[PDB]
Amino acid sequence: GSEVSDKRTCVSLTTQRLPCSRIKTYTITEGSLRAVIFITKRGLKVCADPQATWVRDCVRSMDRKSNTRNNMIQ
């Protein structure tokens, strides 16, 4: 169902916030509608609005974690 899909697994974006500590990893989808998918630490996928300030903080927080070479994906 929602397990695998790729491309754009979802078309709706969450504008409301999630704790940035629940961010597992993100994937930005590029096209005409850009959506950033965040996986939560529970292992579920969430889709978030990339122009949300909190999203920008987290999508960039994970981006910042990608500057240094140590990515604990667990």
From Swiss-Prot:
One of its GO terms (biological process) is positive regulation of T-helper 1 cell cytokine production. Disulfide bonds join C10-C47. This is Lymphotactin. Its main location: secreted. The gene is XCL1. The chain holds residues 23 to 96 of 114 of the full protein. Belongs to the intercrine gamma family. GO terms for molecular function: CCR chemokine receptor binding; chemokine activity; chemokine receptor binding; protein homodimerization activity. Keywords: Chemotaxis, Cytokine, Disulfide bond, Secreted, Signal. One of its GO terms (cellular component) is extracellular region. It is found in: Secreted. Highest level in spleen, lower in peripheral leukocytes and very low levels in lung, colon and small intestine. Chemotactic activity for lymphocytes but not for monocytes or neutrophils. In thymus, mediates medullary accumulation of thymic dendritic cells and contributes to regulatoy T cell development, playing a role in self-tolerance establishment.
